Amino acid sequence: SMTLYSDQELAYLQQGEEAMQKALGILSNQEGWKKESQQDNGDKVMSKVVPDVGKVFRLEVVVDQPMERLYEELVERMEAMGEWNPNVKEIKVLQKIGKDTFITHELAAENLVGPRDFVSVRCAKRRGSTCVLAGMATDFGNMPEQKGVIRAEHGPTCMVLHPLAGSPSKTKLTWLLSIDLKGWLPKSIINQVLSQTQVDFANHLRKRLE
């Protein structure tokens, strides 16, 4: 039947789709990206200075594993993704709204870069054959910043799972990343870290799959 939503919810709901459309729009704009890395596995990391946001990172990786498996392992079981991933210490779902959107507190581990956590809303939609994780830093007053860890913010961040052009057994994972670490960190160093952060996620992801 019909369900009703508090204005605060609808707020998060909007954000859940504002983050999605804007991140997809950054992928729709195909050509224009520079290149940051090129792996032995054919893994790629593109970059671009978006007017609205700023310098973003686009991870180009394909995996020799079923798509739906990556789904449950990446979202349905994301709370425990802190196990097979060193770059993250603890991820906790603060609240689920409706079917797609939900707010999370992602606490990532640091040794020259100070520890940083995140409180963001994220939408897990799928047009059937293609699943996609959206998200962006949200304001969850019911979980303010704690002493010790610095609250960094996420820009329009998406992640697309697409069955291989000619192989259902394979999946093309496209991960557009946008973050504002919000430290005093130099401009240069921020680039390489966010890049390797992506290349690492790809590695650990493949390893978990086994």
Residue numbers in the entry: 64 to 173, 177 to 276
The publication says:
The ∼210 residue globular START module is a curved β-sheet gripped by two α-helices. The concave face of the β-sheet and the C-terminal α-helix enclose a hydrophobic cavity that can accommodate lipid molecules.
Group 1 contains the name-giving family member, steroidogenic acute regulatory protein (StAR/STARD1), and STARD3. In the StAR group there is a similar ion pair between the β–strands, namely, Glu169 and Arg188, which is not found in other family members that bind cholesterol. Arg188 has been suggested to bind to the hydroxyl group of cholesterol and it is also present in PCTP and RhoGAP groups. All structures reported are relevant to disease. They are down- (STARD13) or up-regulated (STARD5) in cancers, mutations in them result in metabolic disorders (STARD1) or they are linked to obesity (STARD14;).
